[PDB]
Amino acid sequence: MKTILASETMEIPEEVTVKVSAKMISVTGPRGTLTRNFKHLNLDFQLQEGGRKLKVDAWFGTRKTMAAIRTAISHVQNLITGVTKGFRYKMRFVY
RNA sequence: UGAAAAGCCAGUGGCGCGAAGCUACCGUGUGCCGGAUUAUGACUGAACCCUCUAAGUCAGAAUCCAAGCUAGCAUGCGA
């Protein structure tokens, strides 16, 4: 069965400006800008604050669609920590 | 064929060598660049910490499609 409304929201810290333009998310911080297209997802992204929140919800979704809500949140969270702290992977030489 | 010289007949008289042309892995020369992917291994990532999968991505082949090569009266078309 389809739930009427499944929603998940998240915080957006200051010094980071998030822009939503028809499922295109741009995140800008000290380290630069990051962009993710989400037009493949079928949800709606609403800032619902002074740019300090972001709520993503699906209407009449099945269990597969609501799985995308947490996926989208974590992807957008990745853009925030990418432009505030960056990412670093350490590889080791084994021989 | 009177001899000699010069030939001719024996359906190519026979033998030796024989250019030209044709021709032999029996001789010589040449034979090919990009994209998408299979299998599989991975990235990120929920569902539900994890997870190559659900959404979204990567690498990938004597493979496929191109390119190249042959034709092109395709009742096609340009200058």
Ligand SMILES: [K+]
């Ligand atoms: K010859």
Ligand SMILES: [Mg+2]
């Ligand atoms: Mg004589």
Ligand SMILES: [Mg+2]
């Ligand atoms: Mg006679």
Ligand SMILES: [Mg+2]
């Ligand atoms: Mg004889």
Ligand SMILES: [Mg+2]
């Ligand atoms: Mg040969």
Ligand SMILES: [Mg+2]
């Ligand atoms: Mg994983």
Ligand SMILES: [Mg+2]
């Ligand atoms: Mg696969």
Ligand SMILES: [Mg+2]
């Ligand atoms: Mg590839």
